[PDB]
Design a protein around this ligand. Structure first.
Ligand SMILES: Nc1ncnc2c1ncn2[C@@H]1O[C@H](COP(=O)(O)OP(=O)(O)OP(=O)(O)O)[C@@H](O)[C@H]1O
Ligand SMILES: [Mg+2]
Lengths: 55, 448, 109
């Protein structure tokens, strides 16, 4: 759970997303499936999002 | 009635400002020791602080002299003789004053004032002429300014050698600095300098044009606005300097603290009050936010001379230091704030440099605070909390303070003064006569 | 009176003209034009270029009381916290509005 600090489409399929909390930031490699879930919701840089990694 | 009428009498502090103090004779004992100490291991060390020119002997642990960069010159025409002053001999009783520096700026500009200040320094050090001078510079000091100073040193005083180094970098060397991010907030400005293997990466240093001067000027602007209906004390920047020093602090969460700051509950604790001098022969004030802003929980009347002669700081306690963190919001300075500057360096610049190895991790492990304007409460904690959110989680951030924020830059130059690094960086008078005052030896603590 | 005499004795005791400065080169005299502003020096110099504006959106604070300001007055362009401060803003002494702006370096011109 964090503020979306970066959204970098890695392929032209994969996304890399950067997430930040008050206590640090993190990068995640996203499968195209979870990417399009993130993209079906209208997530943009500066949004706050909740992700469950395995579900 | 009761919520004010039950309160104790207000605690109020006398106003302070810079003033003359008992005479200091010229210390001939320094000249004696300087000639007794071994050859090639003695220098005069001058830190050109825009707040205080600090001068003394490299072989001593503290400056002999700490002097405002000001002069005064006037005639009491009934007495006929001219009088002339440079430093705290200017009573900051005419206060007919000029300053060596351009206002709020790190760079010397009134060279005649500077030359009178240097005359005062060499008198107080007991010069009886011939001694090496170590002198501090602004970051990226202007070539013309470097020339004009060195020209004074070599034409007017004929000194054997001069060396220029950055005061914040001397401070980073008095402490056991090796690699780190040097954050300086000074009188003139605020600089973030990345230092790698004791060498500053001045091409990657950044300056924020806010400092202890701008805080005193901004505090004055706000208090003039607070009491725009007129205030009987003569508000001056030299007073608001002491107000900023004594009463300001950095908020750990500014919006949360600010939005509740003028709630009448506990406002008597959030408020602090200073007394200017005086002499004496369903809609209510208690529901007015502007009464709280100006006069706090007590009732006010203009009959009370003392109560008319006091300013209430209140929101200015925290609004003034926040200009470093939010310059464009609070003071309209179109510059990124301190946390955004340090984050841009650590996260965007240093990992992009060739060959720098483990950026940020190398630099990130020692963010280091220098200069007097860093001395605010929670300043280090606020800077750490801000950077922590910008860094990869669990990264080994440490934010550390110099052992002294003001003298330690002089102590670093005094320790460095006669090392082989320094004497390799010295320019001799003949080298100046060859190369001219624009020339400088490239070294880790100096400008390009 | 002795207090004035003692004061003038201090004014004498401090005077940098009463002190003689043998280390000062008597021959060298400065160029009278040497004192120049930073603007002049930079103009005549035609790294000391060292920062840029933030891209983040800035927060809004009341120009009067510094508290957060939801509102911007369209008439005077002062930012204000609440109706109590709007009431004082709209009846300010005529020149005062430009001072609240100038405290944040804003101006009408
Ligand atoms: N305890 C303190 N808390 C806050 N501010 C302080 C404190 N002590 C001193 N200051 C302020 O720090 C400033 C002095 O900073 P410093 O002496 O490091 O600058 P400087 O060397 O004169 O400047 P520069 O290198 O820019 O020419 C003054 O504005 C002074 O009011
Ligand atoms: Mg300094």
């Amino acid at each position: 759970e964090g503020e979306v600090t970066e959204m970098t489409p890695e392929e032209a399929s994969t996304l890399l997303i950067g997430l930040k909390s008050a206590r640090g930031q993190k990068k995640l490699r996203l499968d195209p499936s979870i990417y399009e879930a993130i993209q079906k919701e209208r997530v943009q840089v500066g949004d706050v999002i909740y992700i469950e990694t395995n579900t | 009635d009761e919520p004010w009428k039950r309160l104790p009498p207000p605690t109020v502090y006398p106003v302070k400002e810079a003033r003359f103090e008992k005479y200091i004779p010229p210390q001939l004992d320094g000249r004696e020791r300087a000639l007794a100490q071994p050859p090639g291991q003695v220098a005069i060390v001058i830190d050109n602080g825009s707040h205080s020119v600090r001068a003394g002997w490299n072989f001593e642990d503290k400056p002999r002299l700490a002097i405002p960069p000001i002069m005064s010159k006037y005639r009491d025409r009934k007495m006929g003789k001219t009088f002339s002053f440079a430093g705290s001999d200017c009573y900051a009783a005419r206060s007919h004053i000029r300053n060596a520096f351009e206002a709020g700026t790190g760079i010397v500009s009134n060279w005649d004032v500077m030359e009178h200040v240097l005359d005062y320094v060499f008198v107080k050090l007991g010069m009886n002429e011939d001694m090496p001078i170590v002198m501090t510079e602004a970051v990226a000091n202007l070539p013309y300014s470097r020339k004009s100073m060195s020209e004074i040193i070599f034409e007017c005083y004929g000194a054997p050698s001069l060396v220029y180094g950055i005061d914040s970098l001397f401070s980073f060397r008095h402490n056991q600095g090796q690699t780190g991010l040097v954050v300086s907030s000074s009188y003139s400005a605020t600089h973030v300098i990345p230092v790698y293997n004791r060498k500053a990466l001045l091409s990657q240093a950044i300056r924020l044009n806010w400092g202890g001067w701008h805080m005193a000027e901004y505090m004055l602007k706000l208090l003039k606005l607070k009491y725009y209906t007129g205030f009987p004390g003569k508000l001056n920047s030299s007073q608001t300097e002491h107000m900023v020093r004594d009463f300001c602090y950095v908020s750990l969460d500014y919006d949360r603290e600010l939005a509740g700051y003028l709630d009448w509950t506990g406002l008597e604790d959030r408020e602090r009050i200073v007394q200017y001098p005086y002499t004496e022969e369903q809609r209510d004030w208690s529901k007015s936010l502007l009464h709280a802003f100006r006069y706090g929980p007590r009732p006010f009347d203009p009959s009370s001379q003392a109560e008319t002669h006091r300013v209430h700081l209140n929101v200015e306690r925290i609004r003034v230091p926040e200009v470093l963190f939010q310059p464009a919001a609070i003071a309209g300075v179109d510059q990124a704030g301190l946390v955004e500057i340090a984050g841009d360096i650590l996260c965007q610049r240093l990992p992009s440099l060739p060959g720098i190895q483990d950026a940020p991790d190398a630099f990130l492990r020692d963010v280091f605070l220098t200069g007097g304007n860093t001395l605010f409460q929670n300043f280090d904690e606020r800077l750490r909390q801000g950077l922590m959110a910008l860094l990869p989680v669990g990264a080994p951030l440490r934010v550390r303070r110099a052992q002294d924020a003001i003298l330690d830059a002089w102590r670093g130059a005094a320790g460095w003064a006669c090392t082989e690094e320094a004497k390799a960086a010295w320019i001799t008078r003949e080298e100046y006569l060859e190369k001219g005052g624009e020339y400088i030896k490239e070294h880790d603590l100096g400008n390009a | 009176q002795s207090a004035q005499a003692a004061h003038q004795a201090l004014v004498e005791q401090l005077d940098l003209h009463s002190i003689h400065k043998t280390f000062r080169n008597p021959n060298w005299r400065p160029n009278q034009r040497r004192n120049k502003t930073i603007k002049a020096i930079l103009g005549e110099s035609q790294t000391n270029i060292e920062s840029a504006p933030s891209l983040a959106p800035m927060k809004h604070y009341c120009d009067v009381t510094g508290l957060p300001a939801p509102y911007l007055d369209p008439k005077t362009r002062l930012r204000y916290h609440n109706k109590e401060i709007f009431a004082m803003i709209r009846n300010l002494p005529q020149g005062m509005g430009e001072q609240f702006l100038e405290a944040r370096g804003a101006h009408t011109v």
